[PDB]
Scaffold this active site. Sequence first.
Site, PDB file in Angstrom:
ATOM      1  CG  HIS A  37      -0.210   4.140   4.954  1.00 32.71           C
ATOM      2  ND1 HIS A  37      -0.875   3.313   5.844  1.00 32.71           N
ATOM      3  CD2 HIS A  37      -1.006   5.206   4.755  1.00 32.71           C
ATOM      4  CE1 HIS A  37      -2.015   3.898   6.170  1.00 32.71           C
ATOM      5  NE2 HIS A  37      -2.116   5.035   5.525  1.00 32.71           N
TER       6      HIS A  37
ATOM      7  CG  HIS B 177      -4.047  -0.540   7.019  1.00 29.97           C
ATOM      8  ND1 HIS B 177      -3.847  -0.019   8.277  1.00 29.97           N
ATOM      9  CD2 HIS B 177      -3.035  -0.083   6.248  1.00 29.97           C
ATOM     10  CE1 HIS B 177      -2.765   0.736   8.254  1.00 29.97           C
ATOM     11  NE2 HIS B 177      -2.233   0.672   7.045  1.00 29.97           N
TER      12      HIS B 177
ATOM     13  CG  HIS C 124      -0.562   0.090   2.507  1.00 34.28           C
ATOM     14  ND1 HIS C 124      -0.097  -1.047   3.160  1.00 34.28           N
ATOM     15  CD2 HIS C 124      -0.693   1.041   3.461  1.00 34.28           C
ATOM     16  CE1 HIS C 124       0.147  -0.744   4.422  1.00 34.28           C
ATOM     17  NE2 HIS C 124      -0.186   0.518   4.637  1.00 34.28           N
TER      18      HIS C 124
ATOM     19  CG  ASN D 295      -3.047   5.547  10.918  1.00 33.12           C
ATOM     20  OD1 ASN D 295      -3.994   6.313  11.155  1.00 33.12           O
ATOM     21  ND2 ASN D 295      -2.234   5.697   9.854  1.00 33.12           N
TER      22      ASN D 295
HETATM   23 CO   LIG Z   1      -0.353   1.370   6.536  1.00 34.25          CO
END
Ligand SMILES: [Co+2]
EC number: 3.5.2.6
Length: 214
Positions: free
Chosen positions: A75, A136, A73, A167
Amino acid sequence: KTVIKNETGTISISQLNKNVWVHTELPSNGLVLNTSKGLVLVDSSWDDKLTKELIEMVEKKFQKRVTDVIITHAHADRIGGIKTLKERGIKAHSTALTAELAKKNGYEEPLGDLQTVTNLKFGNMKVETFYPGKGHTEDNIVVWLPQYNILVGGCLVKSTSAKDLGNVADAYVNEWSTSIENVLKRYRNINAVVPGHGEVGDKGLLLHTLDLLK
Ligand SMILES: [Co+2]
């Protein structure tokens, strides 16, 4: 089993089998795949400094180059070493959405080559990537090694030690349970699940994540 640290406890690799290792950096996990055509990583590390160290450690140990990385992902704990991958000629695979999000957030772009289901082969190592839906993050994918029935859950999957979802700023907490169910339906016989953070487990980590979502 065989665990190998660098100088500093900052990077660790633990062998799952002959050709599959878990990499962990200070805690975030990914895989190192030892293939006949080079090393493949499932996820690189938090930032460029740790990504360079990770690559250097595995290249020296396995005596082959890192050729490819799959980014699970967009992030930072995941996209953060992209500069290093690109400047070294390491192919950074991702879905188009992951690449879109990387660019939007000021990162260099991975390849955006992965579809909902992509089947890759590196030497003799088979790798399937699967986008199960949002969880997520919007974009999170899992990675399956069908020769070993090993699933890399990434941050979609929480470890036993995780007592909450972490998170959730970028998360989709309704869709997440359906996404995990999609993983459970696709992969009905799982030997090991590697969470994004924490200890390796089995299908139970998926059920744990479902419970955390209630
Ligand atoms: Co993440």
